[PDB]
């Protein structure tokens, strides 16, 4: 989850 969001922001 952590990296999925970073990713899409
Ligand atoms: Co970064």
Same mark, same amino acid.
């Not at 989850?1 to 922001?9: G, P, T, V």
């Given at each position: !989850? *952590?990296? *999925? !969001?970073?990713?899409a !922001?």
């Amino acid at each position: !989850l *952590a990296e *999925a !969001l970073h990713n899409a !922001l």
